[PDB]
Design a protein around this ligand. Structure first.
Ligand code: SF4
Length: 188
């Protein structure tokens, strides 16, 4: 089951990211979610609580979600890597391959989401199968193993570029989440 996998993951030591971690942030939400959200990796508060997206950026994600009528508990959230990399740096392709082969793939298999929303360049590069620019793939529909992928700016990116101006990352994000909502409501 997904909960045996979650349980096991707590003792994972497959990549060097295990050295600095406090808690492993495997993931949470609806086990049979139609929508799965995947980010880069955990941060300070995530490392401390073992829960994904609970810090400053995670609180944004919550807001962005409810602003589209999407209840957080009905979706499943995770990241490419489960352990907090030193000083919040992005995960190396090294640890990204290992963690993803050990957990992400099975999580996706067990949950069988119909839409995958990758947050940030790292996550997007995983589902697109190639190096990419988040600003270019953001807001467009893709496909990965039969499932619909829809890349979006990571909430942390919005904190770093807080502009409320038209066409700004925050404005575009708002439009994108609505697009995810329309897509969700049109699923068989
Ligand atoms: S990041 Fe993933 S692979 Fe690396 S130690 Fe944590 S759970 Fe294991």
């Amino acid at each position: 089951t997904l909960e045996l996998l979650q349980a096991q993951a707590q003792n994972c030591t497959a990549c060097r990211l295990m050295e600095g971690r406090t808690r492993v942030v495997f993931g949470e939400g609806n086990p049979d979610a139609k929508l799965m959200i995947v980010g880069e990796g955990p941060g300070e508060e995530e490392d401390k609580t073992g829960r994904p997206f609970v810090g400053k950026a995670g609180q944004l994600l919550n807001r962005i979600l409810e602003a589209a009528g999407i209840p957080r508990e009905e979706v499943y959230i995770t990241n490419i890597v489960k352990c907090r990399p030193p000083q919040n740096r992005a995960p190396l392709p090294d640890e990204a391959k290992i963690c993803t082969d050990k957990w992400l793939l099975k999580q996706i298999e067990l949950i069988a989401p119909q839409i995958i929303v990758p947050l940030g360049a790292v996550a997007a590069e995983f589902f697109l199968g190639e190096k990419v620019s988040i600003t270019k793939v953001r807001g467009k529909w893709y496909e990965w193993h039969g499932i619909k992928v829809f890349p979006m700016f990571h909430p942390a990116y919005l904190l770093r570029n807080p502009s409320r101006a038209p066409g700004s990352p925050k404005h575009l994000t708002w439009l994108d989440i609505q697009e995810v909502k329309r897509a969700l409501d049109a699923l068989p």
